[PDB]
Coordinates of C-alpha atoms and ligand atoms in Angstrom, one line a residue:
Chain A
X1 CA 65.3 63.5 40.7
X2 CA 67.9 66.2 41.4
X3 CA 70.7 66.4 38.9
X4 CA 72.6 68.9 40.5
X5 CA 72.6 66.4 43.6
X6 CA 73.2 63.6 41.4
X7 CA 76.5 64.8 40.4
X8 CA 78.1 64.8 43.4
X9 CA 76.6 61.8 44.3
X10 CA 78.6 60.8 41.0
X11 CA 81.8 62.5 41.5
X12 CA 82.1 61.2 44.7
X13 CA 80.9 57.4 44.5
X14 CA 80.8 57.2 40.7
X15 CA 83.7 58.9 38.5
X16 CA 86.5 56.9 40.6
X17 CA 86.0 53.9 38.1
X18 CA 83.6 56.1 35.3
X19 CA 83.7 58.6 33.0
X20 CA 80.3 60.0 31.2
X21 CA 81.4 62.8 28.8
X22 CA 81.0 60.9 25.1
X23 CA 84.6 60.7 24.0
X24 CA 85.5 59.8 27.8
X25 CA 88.2 57.2 28.6
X26 CA 88.0 54.1 30.1
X27 CA 89.2 53.8 33.4
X28 CA 88.9 51.2 35.9
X29 CA 85.1 50.7 35.0
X30 CA 83.4 51.7 31.8
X31 CA 82.6 55.1 29.6
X32 CA 79.2 55.3 30.4
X33 CA 78.0 57.7 27.6
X34 CA 74.7 56.8 25.8
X35 CA 74.1 54.0 27.8
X36 CA 70.9 54.6 28.3
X37 CA 68.5 52.5 25.6
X38 CA 71.8 50.2 25.5
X39 CA 71.9 46.6 26.0
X40 CA 74.4 45.6 29.6
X41 CA 78.1 45.4 28.3
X42 CA 78.5 47.1 24.6
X43 CA 80.7 50.2 25.4
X44 CA 82.5 49.8 22.8
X45 CA 86.0 49.3 23.3
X46 CA 85.7 48.2 27.2
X47 CA 86.3 44.5 28.1
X48 CA 83.3 43.8 30.5
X49 CA 83.0 40.0 32.8
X50 CA 80.6 37.1 30.9
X51 CA 78.3 38.0 33.5
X52 CA 77.7 42.0 32.6
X53 CA 78.8 40.9 29.0
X54 CA 75.2 38.2 29.2
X55 CA 72.9 39.8 32.1
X56 CA 71.2 41.0 28.9
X57 CA 69.1 43.8 29.8
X58 CA 68.3 47.3 28.6
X59 CA 69.5 50.2 30.6
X60 CA 67.1 52.3 31.6
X61 CA 66.1 54.1 34.8
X62 CA 64.1 51.3 36.4
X63 CA 66.8 48.9 35.5
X64 CA 69.7 51.6 36.9
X65 CA 67.2 52.0 39.8
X66 CA 67.3 47.9 40.9
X67 CA 71.2 47.3 39.7
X68 CA 72.5 50.7 41.5
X69 CA 70.8 49.5 44.8
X70 CA 73.2 46.4 44.9
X71 CA 75.0 45.9 41.6
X72 CA 76.7 41.9 42.3
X73 CA 73.3 41.3 43.6
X74 CA 71.6 42.4 40.3
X75 CA 74.7 40.6 38.1
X76 CA 76.0 37.7 40.4
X77 CA 79.9 37.3 38.6
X78 CA 80.4 40.9 38.1
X79 CA 83.6 42.4 39.0
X80 CA 84.2 46.2 39.8
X81 CA 87.7 46.0 40.3
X82 CA 91.3 44.3 40.5
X83 CA 92.6 45.5 43.9
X84 CA 96.3 43.3 43.1
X85 CA 99.5 44.1 41.8
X86 CA 100.5 40.9 38.8
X87 CA 104.2 42.1 38.1
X88 CA 106.3 40.7 40.7
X89 CA 109.1 43.8 41.5
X90 CA 106.2 46.1 42.1
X91 CA 105.1 43.4 44.6
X92 CA 108.5 43.3 46.2
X93 CA 108.3 47.1 46.2
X94 CA 105.3 48.0 47.7
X95 CA 105.8 45.3 50.4
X96 CA 109.0 47.3 51.4
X97 CA 106.9 50.1 51.4
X98 CA 104.7 48.5 54.3
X99 CA 107.2 47.0 56.0
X100 CA 108.8 50.6 57.0
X101 CA 105.0 52.4 57.2
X102 CA 103.0 50.0 58.9
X103 CA 105.7 49.7 61.8
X104 CA 106.6 53.4 61.7
Chain B
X1 CA 112.3 45.9 47.0
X2 CA 112.8 49.7 46.7
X3 CA 110.4 51.6 49.4
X4 CA 110.2 54.7 47.3
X5 CA 108.6 52.7 44.2
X6 CA 106.4 51.2 46.7
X7 CA 105.7 54.1 48.3
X8 CA 104.2 55.5 44.8
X9 CA 102.6 52.4 44.0
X10 CA 100.9 52.8 47.1
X11 CA 100.0 56.0 46.8
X12 CA 98.5 55.2 43.2
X13 CA 96.7 51.5 43.9
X14 CA 96.2 50.8 47.7
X15 CA 95.3 55.0 49.4
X16 CA 92.3 55.1 47.7
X17 CA 91.2 52.7 50.5
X18 CA 93.4 52.0 52.7
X19 CA 95.4 54.2 55.0
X20 CA 99.1 52.7 56.7
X21 CA 99.6 55.3 59.5
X22 CA 99.0 54.6 63.2
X23 CA 96.3 56.1 63.8
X24 CA 95.3 56.7 60.6
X25 CA 91.4 56.2 59.6
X26 CA 89.5 53.0 58.3
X27 CA 88.0 54.0 55.0
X28 CA 87.0 51.3 51.8
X29 CA 89.6 49.3 53.7
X30 CA 91.1 48.6 57.1
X31 CA 93.5 51.1 58.5
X32 CA 96.6 48.4 58.1
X33 CA 99.3 49.7 61.0
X34 CA 100.4 46.6 62.3
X35 CA 99.7 44.4 59.7
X36 CA 103.1 42.6 60.0
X37 CA 102.7 39.8 62.0
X38 CA 99.1 39.8 62.8
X39 CA 96.3 37.2 61.8
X40 CA 93.9 38.4 58.7
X41 CA 90.9 40.4 59.8
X42 CA 92.3 41.7 63.0
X43 CA 92.7 45.7 62.4
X44 CA 90.5 46.9 65.7
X45 CA 87.2 47.9 64.6
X46 CA 87.0 47.5 60.9
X47 CA 83.5 44.8 60.4
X48 CA 85.3 42.2 57.6
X49 CA 83.8 39.5 55.5
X50 CA 83.6 36.2 57.0
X51 CA 86.1 34.8 54.3
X52 CA 88.8 38.0 55.6
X53 CA 87.8 36.9 58.4
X54 CA 88.4 33.3 58.4
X55 CA 91.8 32.2 56.4
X56 CA 93.5 32.6 58.7
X57 CA 97.4 32.8 57.9
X58 CA 99.6 35.5 59.4
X59 CA 100.3 38.7 57.2
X60 CA 104.5 38.8 56.3
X61 CA 105.9 39.1 53.3
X62 CA 106.0 35.9 51.7
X63 CA 101.9 35.7 52.1
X64 CA 101.6 39.5 51.0
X65 CA 103.3 38.6 47.9
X66 CA 101.1 35.9 47.4
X67 CA 97.5 37.6 48.5
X68 CA 98.7 40.9 46.3
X69 CA 99.3 38.4 43.3
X70 CA 95.3 38.6 43.3
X71 CA 93.6 38.8 46.4
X72 CA 90.4 36.8 45.3
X73 CA 92.5 34.0 44.6
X74 CA 94.3 34.2 48.2
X75 CA 90.8 34.8 50.0
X76 CA 88.0 33.6 48.1
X77 CA 85.4 35.2 49.1
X78 CA 86.7 38.8 49.9
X79 CA 85.1 41.6 48.8
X80 CA 87.3 45.1 48.1
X81 CA 83.9 47.8 47.7
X82 CA 80.0 47.7 47.4
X83 CA 79.6 49.9 44.1
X84 CA 76.1 50.5 44.6
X85 CA 73.8 53.4 45.9
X86 CA 71.3 51.7 49.1
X87 CA 69.8 55.5 49.4
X88 CA 66.6 55.4 47.3
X89 CA 66.7 59.3 46.7
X90 CA 70.3 59.4 45.8
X91 CA 69.1 56.4 43.5
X92 CA 67.0 58.7 41.9
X93 CA 69.2 61.8 41.7
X94 CA 72.3 60.3 40.5
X95 CA 69.6 58.3 37.8
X96 CA 68.8 61.7 36.5
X97 CA 72.0 63.2 35.8
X98 CA 73.1 59.6 34.2
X99 CA 70.1 60.9 32.2
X100 CA 71.4 63.9 31.4
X101 CA 75.1 63.8 31.0
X102 CA 75.6 59.9 28.9
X103 CA 73.0 61.6 26.3
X104 CA 74.7 65.6 26.5
Ligands
LIG1 C1 85.0 50.8 40.6 C2 85.6 50.5 41.6 C3 83.9 51.0 40.0 C4 83.2 51.9 40.7 C5 83.8 52.7 42.1 C6 81.6 51.3 40.0 N1 81.5 51.0 39.0 FE1 80.5 50.6 37.1 N2 81.8 49.2 36.9 C7 82.7 49.2 37.1 C8 83.6 47.4 36.5 C9 84.6 47.5 36.2 C10 82.4 47.7 35.1 C11 82.0 46.3 34.6 C12 81.7 45.5 35.1 C13 81.6 44.0 34.8 O1 81.3 42.5 35.4 O2 82.5 43.5 33.4 C14 81.1 48.4 36.1 C15 79.7 48.5 35.6 C16 78.9 49.7 35.2 C17 77.8 49.5 34.9 C18 76.9 48.4 33.6 C19 77.9 49.0 32.3 C20 77.6 48.5 31.2 O3 76.3 47.5 31.2 O4 77.7 48.8 29.9 C21 77.2 50.4 34.8 C22 75.6 51.1 34.7 C23 77.8 51.2 35.9 N3 79.0 50.8 36.5 C24 77.5 52.1 36.9 C25 78.1 53.1 38.2 C26 77.9 53.7 38.4 C27 76.4 55.2 38.5 C28 78.3 54.2 40.0 C29 78.5 55.0 41.4 C30 77.5 54.6 41.5 C31 79.6 52.9 39.6 N4 79.2 52.0 38.7 C32 80.9 52.5 40.5 C33 83.4 49.8 37.9 C34 83.0 50.6 39.0
LIG2 C1 89.2 49.6 47.9 C2 88.8 49.7 46.0 C3 90.3 48.8 47.8 C4 91.1 48.7 47.1 C5 91.6 49.3 46.1 C6 92.4 47.9 47.6 N1 92.0 47.3 49.1 FE1 92.8 46.2 50.2 N2 90.7 45.7 51.0 C7 90.2 46.4 51.0 C8 88.5 46.1 51.5 C9 87.4 46.8 51.6 C10 89.4 44.9 52.0 C11 88.4 43.8 53.7 C12 88.2 42.7 52.9 C13 87.0 41.5 53.3 O1 87.1 40.7 52.7 O2 87.2 41.9 54.7 C14 90.9 45.1 52.5 C15 91.8 43.6 52.7 C16 92.9 44.1 52.6 C17 94.2 43.2 53.2 C18 93.8 42.4 54.2 C19 93.5 43.4 55.8 C20 93.7 42.5 56.7 O3 93.1 41.4 57.1 O4 93.8 42.9 57.9 C21 95.7 43.6 52.8 C22 97.0 43.4 53.5 C23 95.3 44.8 51.7 N3 93.4 44.8 51.8 C24 95.8 45.5 51.0 C25 95.9 46.3 49.9 C26 96.6 46.7 49.2 C27 98.7 46.8 49.6 C28 96.6 47.5 48.0 C29 97.1 48.4 47.1 C30 97.8 47.4 46.0 C31 95.1 47.5 48.0 N4 95.0 46.3 49.5 C32 93.9 47.8 47.7 C33 89.5 47.3 50.1 C34 90.9 47.9 48.9

């Protein structure tokens, strides 16, 4: 596989939720440094779904090839994002902006 | 609600998958212009899930307040993102980059 091309894919498709650097922060998704040879659900400090915690496989080329084809088929129950807004005041402010912008 | 604050929320939490401008493109999510007073699942040209197509409610302040609190509770079956990589060669290139970056 080509590292240059895979870097570009990573930046375009993965970096919004994941870092890969050593010492890198958790974002929407876990930091992935040391993933290879690690079991699912093991980045220290990250709260996974029970599905991702329990899948029990070891990450490596072959299992990433299958997972990446369709994460939710490979780990049914996995959740990639929470798209909502829990705070009442943020919801009200966002709704007021949407009422303006989606009408003008 | 405060339009200024809601604009900032939109940019930080929604704009990665949605546009709101008239004439705006579909991205991961549908363009939202003309949402208010429209039924779910109606942006022209966008392929929704059957869940979002069938929910059958009208979008307005009160229904957005509930949806935004937790989209998947309000529309069980909804899907916000496909995080995978369907092409074999992209997967191989991405895996090769991850093998390098997550180890160095
Ligand atoms: C935000 C919308 C995400 C995008 C885009 C991608 N990933 Fe992700 N990933 C995300 C979360 C929230 C989680 C944990 C899910 C859960 O059910 O707990 C994950 C998980 C992974 C994993 C497994 C990690 C582990 O077991 O420790 C991998 C290997 C992974 N994600 C890789 C990955 C790649 C390479 C992406 C680009 C194609 C990508 N993800 C997108 C959030 C998000
Ligand atoms: C990408 C990860 C998304 C983020 C972040 C947000 N939304 Fe979204 N939204 C997304 C998709 C793919 C879809 C269609 C889902 C389906 O099951 O088909 C939606 C849907 C909506 C809707 C309903 C639109 C309609 O019925 O026509 C609304 C009102 C909506 N999204 C609003 C919205 C807001 C305000 C967000 C910021 C808080 C937001 N979404 C995040 C994808 C994504």
